[PDB]
C-alpha cells in the first residue's frame, strides 16, 4: 500500500534484525550462491530484488523476510513451475501462498514478497500479512534505521543482535561458555574484494582491560576503544571471501 | 684445535644466544640477502658455511659470531680484494685480522671464522681468540644444547633469550611498557615455504588466565598451555616470508 514499513511487517520481538541491500553486494551474493543447484533461479530473484529485511525469532525457531523488489505473476509462476517440492493455493482475494516443508512464500503485491521459514512453530503467512495493514513497531538502533531509510540509498548490510554474547560464542567457537553481554550492532560495506565493518557491543557487567583490548585489536587488525560499557571496533576489514564463508555456516 | 666448543668462544654472559645451521635454511637466507649489494659474496660465504653460533651483549652493544665452515686463504683474500672499507693486518703468527668501522673478522684456522661487530666498546678480536685455548662455559637450555651438538645433524634455528620481556615488547611493538618476564626459548624448523616453531617463556610473577591464553592462541594460530610458570607454544607456524621480514628489522 501507500506506507508499508518492512520492519513493521517482519515483526517486533526478534532476537536478530537484518537489512541487506542487493546493490553493491552482488559479488558477495554470488559467492554465497555458488554452492547451490538452484543458483540460476536465485540469481534471477536477486536481479529482481532491491533489499531484504529479516528477523530471526529463537523461541519459535523461525526467520521472517520482507523482500522489496519486482515480482510480477509471470516471473513467480516461472520460478514456481521450475521448482521441486513446492505447492501453491490461491486465497479468497487472488493472492498466491507458496508452501514448502519448512518455507512459506507469498507475493501480496507485485513490489514485495514475504517469506517465513523454520520450524513447525513458525508464524502463519496470514498473520504476517495482517501486518501490512497493522504493522508492529520494533525498536532499532539509529544507524540501523538510517541504512533502512530511503531504499536504494544505502549499500551497507546492517545487523542488530539483541544478545551479543550468543553471537560471539558461536562465531569465535566456544559454544559452551557464557558471557553476560548486551546488544550488538554490526555494519558492513563493500570496498574492493573486501568488506569494511563497524561493530559495537554493550558489555553489561563484563570488564575488558587494556591487555584484552590490545589482543582483540590484533586478532582483528582494527582500532578498539571503550566508551563506558560499549566496546567499539572501527576501521576493521574482512575479505569478501572470508565473509562469504561465515554466512554459509548458517 | 682438537676440541673447540663454539659457544665457549662467543663467550658467557650474553643476553641472547643463537644457533643457525645453513642446511635446510638456504631459502630463508636467500630471502634475507635479496636486499643487499654484496649478495653475490654473502651467497659464496653461505656456500662455505655449515653453521653460525652467535651471542649478543647489550651492555657493550656487540654481537660475536663463530662460523664453522671452510675458509681457505685464497677464498677470504678474494672476498677481501672485492670489498670496500676493509683493511687487514697479519699478526705475529701469520693470522689475518680484518677490520672495518664497526666489524672485526679473523680466520684463525681454515675451518672457522670469528666475527665481532657493534659499538666501539665491542670486544677485541685478540680476547675472543684467547677463548680458543681457554673457552668460557655458558649455560644453555637442553634443546639449545641438543641442536648445537654434532654439527650437521640439526636444521633447527635456536634462540635463547635471557630476558623474554624485552623481546616481546620489541616484536609485538609496545616499546614503552614493561613486563616482568623470565627467559625465552625459540626453535624454528623449515617445512615447505614456512617455518614450524616452538616457544617457551618463563612468566616470573606475570599471570596469564584462560581469556589471555585463548586470544594469543588465536593471534598466533597455535596450541597454548601453561606448565606452572612456563608458557609453552607448540604447533605454530610462520611463513618463511613473514619470518624473513622480522629478521631484516635488525
From Swiss-Prot, chains A, B:
UniProt entry keywords in alphabetical sequence: Cell outer membrane, Lipoprotein, Membrane, Palmitate, Signal
Phenotype upon changing residue 132 to E: No change in detergent partitioning, vesicle associated
Positions of region (Amphipathic helix 4): 73-82
Effect of residue 219 to E: No longer partitions into detergent, no vesicle association, decreased dimer formation
Region (Amphipathic helix 9): 240-249
Effect ascribed to mutating residue 32 to E: No change in detergent partitioning, vesicle associated
Region (Amphipathic helix 2): 26-33
Sequence segments annotated as region (Amphipathic helix 8): 210-220
Domain characteristics, as noted in the entry: Forms a U-shaped beta-half-barrel with a large hydrophobic cavity (3549 Angstroms(3)). The cavity is opened when amphipathic helices 2, 3 and 9 move away from helices 7 and 8. Has 5 potential amphipathic helices (P1 to P5, residues 56 to 63, 155 to 162, 194 to 202, 240 to 250, and 270 to 279 respectively); P2, P3 and P5 form helices in the presence of lipid vesicles.
The protein's name: Outer membrane protein TP0453
Naturally occurring in which organism (per UniProt): Treponema pallidum (strain Nichols)
